[PDB]
Subunit: 90 residues, 2 copies
């Protein structure tokens, strides 16, 4: 379990609400990844290969990626608490 | 930048941040952390407010479920998740900044 506090937070919640939260969390993650991808694609080549780093544009991409990773950690936790990955149409 | 607490008990909670921030100018890692600090404070305020707005039956645990409850939970999830991020940035910096 990546984010332990979610155990206690979701304690007692009806299983349909847990599933619902988890499905919405899948949708959010995918939206976050698409955003992080978009910003990455717009970076100059040099930042893409790691030759250069820093500056506002690169920081914005980094921030988008952090949000994506933080979310994924939550999502993985939700899977452990739910007991499954729900079927979601992509 | 201004330091709040030195020699932190580093918990690297979100591994990918290390590679993300590798090589940044120190000023840029500090700008990231500061904005993460401000973000976290914000998320806490929102989750705490949503909690206080719940009907007293939900706060006591006499009731659960439904859209309002879910909304509090999701806000809370976002707060915990962002705090995992922030604790990792503190590990990378080696200190907690004052903001």
């Amino acid at each position: 379990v990546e984010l332990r506090p979610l155990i206690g937070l979701t304690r007692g919640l009806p299983p349909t609400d847990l599933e619902t939260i988890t499905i919405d969390a899948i949708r959010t993650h995918r939206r976050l990844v698409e955003k992080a991808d978009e910003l990455f694609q717009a970076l100059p080549e040099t930042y893409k290969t790691g030759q250069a780093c820093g500056g506002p544009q690169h920081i914005r991409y980094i921030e988008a990626s952090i949000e994506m990773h933080a979310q994924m950690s939550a999502l993985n936790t939700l899977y452990s608490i739910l007991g499954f990955i729900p079927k979601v149409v992509v």
